[PDB]
Write a protein that holds these residues in place. Structure first.
Motif, PDB file in Angstrom:
ATOM      1  N   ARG A   1     -11.492   6.964  12.455  1.00 43.30           N
ATOM      2  CA  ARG A   1     -10.182   7.592  12.634  1.00 43.30           C
ATOM      3  C   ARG A   1      -9.351   7.325  11.362  1.00 43.30           C
ATOM      4  O   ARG A   1      -9.691   7.845  10.305  1.00 43.30           O
ATOM      5  CB  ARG A   1      -9.582   7.111  13.958  1.00 43.30           C
ATOM      6  CG  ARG A   1     -10.342   7.619  15.182  1.00 43.30           C
ATOM      7  CD  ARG A   1      -9.727   7.215  16.501  1.00 43.30           C
ATOM      8  NE  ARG A   1      -9.835   5.775  16.711  1.00 43.30           N
ATOM      9  CZ  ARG A   1     -10.883   5.150  17.251  1.00 43.30           C
ATOM     10  NH1 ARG A   1     -11.904   5.844  17.744  1.00 43.30           N
ATOM     11  NH2 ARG A   1     -10.894   3.823  17.276  1.00 43.30           N
ATOM     12  N   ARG A   2      -8.270   6.549  11.457  1.00 47.21           N
ATOM     13  CA  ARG A   2      -7.450   6.276  10.250  1.00 47.21           C
ATOM     14  C   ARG A   2      -7.612   4.822   9.786  1.00 47.21           C
ATOM     15  O   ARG A   2      -7.599   3.875  10.580  1.00 47.21           O
ATOM     16  CB  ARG A   2      -5.957   6.516  10.500  1.00 47.21           C
ATOM     17  CG  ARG A   2      -5.630   7.865  11.114  1.00 47.21           C
ATOM     18  CD  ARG A   2      -4.141   8.006  11.327  1.00 47.21           C
ATOM     19  NE  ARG A   2      -3.430   8.329  10.112  1.00 47.21           N
ATOM     20  CZ  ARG A   2      -3.199   9.565   9.675  1.00 47.21           C
ATOM     21  NH1 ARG A   2      -3.651  10.612  10.342  1.00 47.21           N
ATOM     22  NH2 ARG A   2      -2.505   9.746   8.565  1.00 47.21           N
ATOM     23  N   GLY A   3      -7.782   4.657   8.477  1.00 49.05           N
ATOM     24  CA  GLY A   3      -7.876   3.348   7.891  1.00 49.05           C
ATOM     25  C   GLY A   3      -8.987   2.539   8.526  1.00 49.05           C
ATOM     26  O   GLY A   3     -10.128   3.004   8.618  1.00 49.05           O
ATOM     27  N   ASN A   4      -8.650   1.343   9.011  1.00 52.75           N
ATOM     28  CA  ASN A   4      -9.639   0.443   9.595  1.00 52.75           C
ATOM     29  C   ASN A   4      -9.698   0.560  11.125  1.00 52.75           C
ATOM     30  O   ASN A   4     -10.253  -0.319  11.792  1.00 52.75           O
ATOM     31  CB  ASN A   4      -9.413  -0.985   9.114  1.00 52.75           C
ATOM     32  CG  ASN A   4      -9.534  -1.084   7.607  1.00 52.75           C
ATOM     33  OD1 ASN A   4     -10.565  -0.683   7.032  1.00 52.75           O
ATOM     34  ND2 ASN A   4      -8.491  -1.596   6.966  1.00 52.75           N
ATOM     35  N   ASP A   5      -9.154   1.659  11.661  1.00 50.50           N
ATOM     36  CA  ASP A   5      -9.303   1.946  13.075  1.00 50.50           C
ATOM     37  C   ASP A   5     -10.576   2.785  13.239  1.00 50.50           C
ATOM     38  O   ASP A   5     -10.636   3.961  12.798  1.00 50.50           O
ATOM     39  CB  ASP A   5      -8.121   2.732  13.637  1.00 50.50           C
ATOM     40  CG  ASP A   5      -8.336   3.175  15.070  1.00 50.50           C
ATOM     41  OD1 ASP A   5      -9.025   2.432  15.827  1.00 50.50           O
ATOM     42  OD2 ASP A   5      -7.825   4.264  15.430  1.00 50.50           O
ATOM     43  N   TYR A   6     -11.578   2.200  13.881  1.00 49.28           N
ATOM     44  CA  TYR A   6     -12.827   2.895  14.178  1.00 49.28           C
ATOM     45  C   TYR A   6     -13.376   2.337  15.491  1.00 49.28           C
ATOM     46  O   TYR A   6     -12.889   1.280  15.959  1.00 49.28           O
ATOM     47  CB  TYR A   6     -13.865   2.683  13.076  1.00 49.28           C
ATOM     48  CG  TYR A   6     -14.244   1.249  12.842  1.00 49.28           C
ATOM     49  CD1 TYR A   6     -15.247   0.654  13.579  1.00 49.28           C
ATOM     50  CD2 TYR A   6     -13.552   0.466  11.941  1.00 49.28           C
ATOM     51  CE1 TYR A   6     -15.596  -0.665  13.379  1.00 49.28           C
ATOM     52  CE2 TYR A   6     -13.871  -0.870  11.747  1.00 49.28           C
ATOM     53  CZ  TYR A   6     -14.903  -1.428  12.476  1.00 49.28           C
ATOM     54  OH  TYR A   6     -15.268  -2.746  12.305  1.00 49.28           O
TER      55      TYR A   6
ATOM     56  N   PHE B   1      -3.843   7.202   4.482  1.00 47.47           N
ATOM     57  CA  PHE B   1      -3.819   7.190   5.954  1.00 47.47           C
ATOM     58  C   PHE B   1      -2.516   6.606   6.532  1.00 47.47           C
ATOM     59  O   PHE B   1      -2.218   6.823   7.710  1.00 47.47           O
ATOM     60  CB  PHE B   1      -5.048   6.435   6.482  1.00 47.47           C
ATOM     61  CG  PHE B   1      -5.130   5.011   5.997  1.00 47.47           C
ATOM     62  CD1 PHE B   1      -4.494   3.989   6.685  1.00 47.47           C
ATOM     63  CD2 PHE B   1      -5.828   4.697   4.842  1.00 47.47           C
ATOM     64  CE1 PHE B   1      -4.561   2.688   6.223  1.00 47.47           C
ATOM     65  CE2 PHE B   1      -5.895   3.389   4.381  1.00 47.47           C
ATOM     66  CZ  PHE B   1      -5.258   2.390   5.077  1.00 47.47           C
ATOM     67  N   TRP B   2      -1.774   5.837   5.738  1.00 48.92           N
ATOM     68  CA  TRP B   2      -0.499   5.214   6.168  1.00 48.92           C
ATOM     69  C   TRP B   2       0.658   6.223   6.135  1.00 48.92           C
ATOM     70  O   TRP B   2       1.802   5.827   6.421  1.00 48.92           O
ATOM     71  CB  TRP B   2      -0.147   4.010   5.295  1.00 48.92           C
ATOM     72  CG  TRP B   2      -0.120   4.341   3.835  1.00 48.92           C
ATOM     73  CD1 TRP B   2       0.945   4.775   3.092  1.00 48.92           C
ATOM     74  CD2 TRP B   2      -1.248   4.334   2.946  1.00 48.92           C
ATOM     75  NE1 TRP B   2       0.553   5.006   1.801  1.00 48.92           N
ATOM     76  CE2 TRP B   2      -0.784   4.761   1.686  1.00 48.92           C
ATOM     77  CE3 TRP B   2      -2.598   4.015   3.093  1.00 48.92           C
ATOM     78  CZ2 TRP B   2      -1.623   4.831   0.577  1.00 48.92           C
ATOM     79  CZ3 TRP B   2      -3.433   4.123   2.003  1.00 48.92           C
ATOM     80  CH2 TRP B   2      -2.947   4.511   0.758  1.00 48.92           C
TER      81      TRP B   2
ATOM     82  N   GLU C   1     -17.338   6.019  15.264  1.00 51.40           N
ATOM     83  CA  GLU C   1     -16.311   7.054  15.122  1.00 51.40           C
ATOM     84  C   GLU C   1     -15.224   6.481  14.206  1.00 51.40           C
ATOM     85  O   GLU C   1     -14.688   5.402  14.496  1.00 51.40           O
ATOM     86  CB  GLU C   1     -15.681   7.478  16.435  1.00 51.40           C
ATOM     87  CG  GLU C   1     -14.527   8.439  16.228  1.00 51.40           C
ATOM     88  CD  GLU C   1     -13.878   8.944  17.501  1.00 51.40           C
ATOM     89  OE1 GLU C   1     -14.497   9.779  18.149  1.00 51.40           O
ATOM     90  OE2 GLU C   1     -12.738   8.516  17.815  1.00 51.40           O
TER      91      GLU C   1
ATOM     92  N   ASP D   1      -5.045  -5.411   1.554  1.00 50.43           N
ATOM     93  CA  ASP D   1      -3.994  -6.013   0.737  1.00 50.43           C
ATOM     94  C   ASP D   1      -4.266  -7.513   0.721  1.00 50.43           C
ATOM     95  O   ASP D   1      -4.245  -8.149   1.782  1.00 50.43           O
ATOM     96  CB  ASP D   1      -2.629  -5.690   1.363  1.00 50.43           C
ATOM     97  CG  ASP D   1      -1.414  -6.237   0.640  1.00 50.43           C
ATOM     98  OD1 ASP D   1      -1.558  -7.182  -0.155  1.00 50.43           O
ATOM     99  OD2 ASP D   1      -0.315  -5.676   0.859  1.00 50.43           O
TER     100      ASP D   1
ATOM    101  N   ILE E   1       0.827  -1.192   0.000  1.00 52.29           N
ATOM    102  CA  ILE E   1       0.000   0.000   0.000  1.00 52.29           C
ATOM    103  C   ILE E   1       0.874   1.260   0.000  1.00 52.29           C
ATOM    104  O   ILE E   1       0.436   2.283  -0.471  1.00 52.29           O
ATOM    105  CB  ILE E   1      -0.981  -0.041   1.189  1.00 52.29           C
ATOM    106  CG1 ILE E   1      -2.157   0.922   0.989  1.00 52.29           C
ATOM    107  CG2 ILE E   1      -0.254   0.148   2.521  1.00 52.29           C
ATOM    108  CD1 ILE E   1      -3.304   0.686   1.929  1.00 52.29           C
ATOM    109  N   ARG E   2       2.091   1.168   0.542  1.00 56.05           N
ATOM    110  CA  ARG E   2       2.954   2.356   0.646  1.00 56.05           C
ATOM    111  C   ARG E   2       3.225   2.969  -0.740  1.00 56.05           C
ATOM    112  O   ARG E   2       3.592   4.163  -0.803  1.00 56.05           O
ATOM    113  CB  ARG E   2       4.265   2.016   1.357  1.00 56.05           C
ATOM    114  CG  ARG E   2       4.174   1.958   2.875  1.00 56.05           C
ATOM    115  CD  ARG E   2       5.525   1.580   3.466  1.00 56.05           C
ATOM    116  NE  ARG E   2       5.587   1.681   4.916  1.00 56.05           N
ATOM    117  CZ  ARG E   2       6.616   1.263   5.657  1.00 56.05           C
ATOM    118  NH1 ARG E   2       7.673   0.717   5.074  1.00 56.05           N
ATOM    119  NH2 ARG E   2       6.577   1.385   6.977  1.00 56.05           N
TER     120      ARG E   2
END
Ligand SMILES: Nc1ncnc2c1ncn2[C@@H]1O[C@H](COP(=O)(O)O)[C@@H](O)[C@H]1O
Ligand SMILES: Nc1ncnc2c1ncn2[C@@H]1O[C@H](COP(=O)(O)O)[C@@H](O)[C@H]1O
Ligand SMILES: [Cl-]
Ligand SMILES: [Cl-]
Ligand SMILES: [Cl-]
Ligand SMILES: [Cl-]
Ligand SMILES: [Cl-]
Ligand SMILES: [Cl-]
Ligand SMILES: [Cl-]
Ligand SMILES: [Cl-]
Lengths: 438, 438
Positions: B364-369, B224-225, B362, B276, B213-214
């Motif tokens: 936040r970034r990527g798959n952090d919720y 978000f990375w 809520e 990925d 993904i980078r």
């Protein structure tokens, strides 16, 4: 009768002795009322236990005939790794998985504490597991599997017990009158059960679906949902050999327990693996939990990534189907039943033994991470084998693929005819293609 | 013969005309070589398409007999929602799921573009899908299902085509000689296919598992990375009525296409849903992709949460099993086959129609919720029904649970005896309990 409703006066009774108020008061009471209580404390590597050696000492102070600390760490990690290898997780929400950490813990403490009791001539377990949870049933099954002569004393079936120790205030008072000043833990807005594999938070304020992780103080990692909390990105490499996790960040671990403790440290800095689940209990009613399992979550990502690079579609499909089936059996307390063994061994052998390789990840907050590298001598992923640049090495030709497509024609015609039949019989609406009727 | 290896000179040939260099040069060439090309452009709400109306105009400039823009947005969103309702996703890594966005897109463009061709008397599709991918097979099946008289022209089977337009440099030159200055897109380190549901990134540098993904510039959301990228937390509410997403943040959408465009905006600000995957292609070889699907990912979290609050364990188990089965069929181009209909309709009816409610998250970034609230008049989650405070309302008593446990005894004995048999027959090692032999 397996379940004894009355205190077995004059008989030896084993207590799974955590050292909390419930088991402390119960052990003192059993002694004062004429039973012979034996205390067994499981060393489960609890993240919130700072001194296991002190617990048997307190048991002796409260009147235990004998008190033992049974080391369950190696067995807990072995069963956890087996669950990982077999994907034995059935509770998930949008893919976020609960790793069945309590079920695994119960499989290990039911068997090992009942075995310890049996070697001391103790054939009665005074088990306080509630009449409404899952654990009463898990301990019941693991106990009777381990000792066919086991009987279980349920103190909440005993009116003498409910009348004196009917609550925390009454228990603490009971201890006081005996000359013990029990120091209660600070009150929380939920109830926590933990082991080295994970921690679960449930009940009290977490019964409300309007509350959630925002009210939890995590015990295996940080509060990543608090934007004020600083979390440094970190790269981690996880190595597996034949399905066994063997190294982290280039350091080899001979002791899997030490490996999991380090995996927990790594995941813990990020809060990796936390989830919120509404699940179905054994009794067919729902409960809600907030879960932590940072080390297992880290190992799960790496294991799964390697599986996807190594195994064919049918193999992955069976692994996943079997895993969901096995997870439910594990949750029900059937981890050692034949139907569970079948599923677990299949994966431990044919799936896991091919899992040799390394995965590198960057961890950020919670379940936000990135895959950086995937390496394995066993990968079947190999883009160069599909390379067509040099026809001398190309695996198949355009003409070959055309032949493959042509073989599909007869069944395509059959499907087309089915669609017409489904319109004629009223299941589909007439038509690009006939439509499902809503 | 379904696949024509030579240009059908003098015959009408339909082109799925994206307007890229491959289809632009192919359409000009078909015209210059004596065929009668018709251009069909699907409006798929591509996140990277800024002007669909310009594409048929260019087709006419290049020599199309006629050029149409076929609106596929409503059908794409309807099929996407059906896939969501049936959990028709089989590719995942540690629970992170690919939403089969390309397969769904192909089901919609295969059928609808071939139907558009059929209404113009066009029974030949000049389809450039490669001999090594999945799409050649998907388009083949959807095309023949839609038009039983369809023939498919494969230009890469035609040496005259490989000799003149054997590559991008040759194609661009061919256009130049015809008086068209084709303006190529900027070169990327990977290949992208997209629609309103999602985007896929694969090939070139993404063939290496050491890349990831980078290296991707996302087209439906943010990077978000990259720790330098600022992402504001955001709360979102998602409402469903009978399985259909109907409102976001308290705003009701009569048009599901408008709802998905908004869901994409919301998820996109976070990069929600990116993954990925190493997956198994139809031809039983592996490929690697980086995927985006921000709106579907948002709807998936909400849908799944409500399913876990509403449905019993057997129902969830069937939903998930069926979903994995259906996902594979969808991926294979069998979305409209009987065995797929069976799985899809089951979920659309008995699972999805009970899904009425709201979920608040809520991001936040990527798959952090985090999940913040879950509400539904259809929840079976109801802790008060398990309340024992008032025995007058308690659903079962301690004595009732004891009875339930006792009924387990006979089969427990049977399992214990199996373990002894398994030791006797050499499968398990002697012993708390006999152990699996490694
Ligand atoms: N470390 C431990 N050692 C022995 N028994 C335990 C331990 N942890 C829990 N138990 C037993 O399991 C019951 C339920 O545990 P919990 O859900 O943590 O309250 C306790 O009341 C104990 O009887
Ligand atoms: N928006 C569109 N309209 C019509 N045909 C398309 C569209 N997008 C893709 N295609 C067809 O599908 C093929 C593969 O698409 P891609 O994978 O995006 O290159 C293209 O070469 C076209 O023939
Ligand atoms: Cl435990
Ligand atoms: Cl409970
Ligand atoms: Cl269950
Ligand atoms: Cl290796
Ligand atoms: Cl598409
Ligand atoms: Cl390809
Ligand atoms: Cl497949
Ligand atoms: Cl509602």
């Amino acid at each position: 009768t397996t379940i004894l409703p009355n205190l077995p006066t004059g008989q030896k009774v084993g207590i799974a002795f955590s050292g909390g108020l419930d088991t402390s008061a119960a052990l003192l009471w059993m002694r004062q009322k004429g039973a012979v209580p034996y205390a067994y404390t499981a060393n489960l590597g609890q993240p919130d236990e700072p001194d296991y050696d002190e617990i048997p000492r307190r048991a002796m102070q409260y009147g235990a005939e004998a008190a033992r600390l049974v080391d369950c760490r190696a067995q807990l990690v072995a069963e956890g790794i087996a669950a990982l290898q077999a994907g034995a997780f059935h509770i998930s929400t949008a893919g976020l998985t609960y790793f069945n950490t309590t079920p695994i813990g119960r499989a290990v403490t039911g068997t090992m504490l009942v075995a310890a009791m049996k070697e001391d001539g103790v054939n009665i377990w005074g088990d306080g597991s509630t009449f409404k949870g899952n654990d009463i049933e898990r301990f019941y099954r693991y106990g009777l599997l381990t000792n066919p002569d086991l009987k279980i004393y349920k103190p909440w079936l005993d009116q003498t017990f409910i009348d004196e120790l009917g609550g925390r205030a009454e228990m603490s008072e009971y201890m006081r009158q005996a000359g013990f000043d029990y120091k209660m833990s600070a009150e929380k807005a939920y109830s926590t059960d933990s082991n080295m594999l994970g921690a679960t938070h449930e009940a009290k304020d977490l019964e409300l679906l309007s509350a959630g992780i925002r009210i939890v103080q995590p015990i295996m990692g940080v509060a990543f949902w608090q934007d004020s909390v600083q979390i440094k990105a970190e790269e981690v490499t996880v190595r597996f050999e034949e399905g066994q996790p063997v190294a982290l960040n280039g350091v080899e671990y001979a002791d899997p327990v030490e490996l999991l403790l380090e995996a927990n440290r790594i995941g813990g800095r990020h809060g990796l693996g936390m989830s919120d689940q509404i699940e179905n209990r054994i009794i067919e009613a729902k409960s809600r939990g907030i879960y932590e399992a940072p080390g297992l979550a880290l190992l799960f990502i790496a294991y799964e990534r390697l599986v996807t690079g190594i195994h064919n579609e049918d193999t992955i499909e069976q692994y996943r189907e079997n895993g969901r089936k096995l997870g439910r059996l594990l949750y029900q307390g059937r981890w050692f039943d034949p139907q569970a063994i079948m599923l677990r061994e299949t994966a431990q052998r044919w799936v896991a033994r091919a899992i040799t390789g390394e995965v590198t990840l960057e961890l950020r907050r919670g379940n936000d991470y990135s895959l950086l590298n995937t390496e394995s001598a066993n990968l079947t992923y190999a883009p160069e084998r599909l390379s067509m640049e040099k026809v001398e090495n190309a695996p198949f030709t355009p003409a070959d693929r055309i032949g493959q497509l042509t073989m599909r024609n007869l069944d395509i015609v059959d499907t087309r005819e089915k669609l017409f039949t489904y319109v004629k019989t009223g299941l589909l609406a007439p038509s690009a293609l006939p439509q499902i009727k809503d």
